[PDB]
Subunit: 105 residues, 3 copies
């Protein structure tokens, strides 16, 4: 198992491409994204409502925080969105763990 | 980063509004919800809620109200994960999550 | 609260049944599954399973069987998170997730 940070970004659906681009530039090895609904309290939604949730597994905490900081500064003063982070362990993932595999021992 | 509990409720889709109302009455600052499928032990369409709360007791209050009120008659599972919120105006206030 | 491992499998949609059968053969009490997109426009459609297991070994069994069978040929990632189950009739039994003795 290889420790990882699962960065979750839940935001407005119109930001899908803009956020993916950031994730792609970050050096993160990939992402998962899904359609969700949400209700919030920040009261910032540009114009239950339909959102998207990204999940990005990163090798380091700093990479997760650099993504988070770049998304939030660039979009979250103007669009609704929340970003949080969970601890995970990756058991299998060719890209994430490299040809060497995620170990186990 | 500000510590938080991520409460997850996976249950039958017809309970959507009822469960949202409980979440809204708990003091929680919001929720995310999605359509999912599932198999349990006696694929079918259901919903998953995710609710980030400031305290554990708020998460358990939501969980306890939902389960007592609906889980005798409807399928469902409720679990909780630890998270840290990095950005969230409502959840972390004007001062930000540097908490 | 009853401790649990949440096993997450994100992989190609065509493995849905093959993976459900593995989950069912593990002893796991059930699973949640959803449609997602992923990059590893160049987003692709895939599925995500979430399986709460009683023990770590059951989670790793499911993970190992899936990966060994399918991940040479199909895209996928498998990870695990810690969870505590507060309510779940099947997962926690008739005595509930807050039993004492
Ligand atoms: N405490 C929380 N728990 C879970 N999800 C949340 C929470 N707070 C916000 N969200 C998610 O983040 C999204 C954006 O909420 P936010 O408070 O940032 O802005 P908002 O304009 O109030 O959003 P919305 O228009 O949905 O209310 C929500 O729609 C929801 O899916
Ligand atoms: N061990 C588990 N891991 C992940 N999700 C689960 C698990 N057990 C149950 N679930 C989710 O909870 C839902 C409700 O299942 P539960 O066993 O409470 O009742 P059930 O009536 O047998 O459900 P179903 O109609 O799906 O068979 C399931 O569809 C599934 O999405
Ligand atoms: N670092 C990561 N964080 C979150 N999800 C990931 C990550 N890496 C991969 N995934 C998910 O796993 C799926 C499979 O990706 P993987 O890296 O196995 O292969 P790929 O062949 O590059 O996939 P794709 O066809 O999606 O480009 C991806 O579509 C994505 O949903
Ligand atoms: Na709002
Ligand atoms: Na790829």
């Amino acid at each position: 198992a290889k420790p990882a940070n699962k960065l979750v970004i839940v935001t407005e659906k119109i930001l899908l491409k803009k956020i993916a681009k950031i994730i792609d530039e970050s050096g993160a090895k990939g992402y998962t994204v899904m359609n969700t609904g949400g209700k919030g309290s920040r009261n910032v939604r540009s114009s239950i409502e339909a959102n998207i949730k990204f999940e990005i597994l990163t090798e380091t905490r700093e990479m997760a925080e650099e993504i988070a900081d770049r998304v939030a500064v660039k979009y979250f003063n103007d669009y609704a969105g929340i970003i949080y982070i969970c601890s995970a362990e990756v058991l299998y993932g060719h890209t994430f763990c490299g040809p060497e595999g995620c170990s186990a021992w």
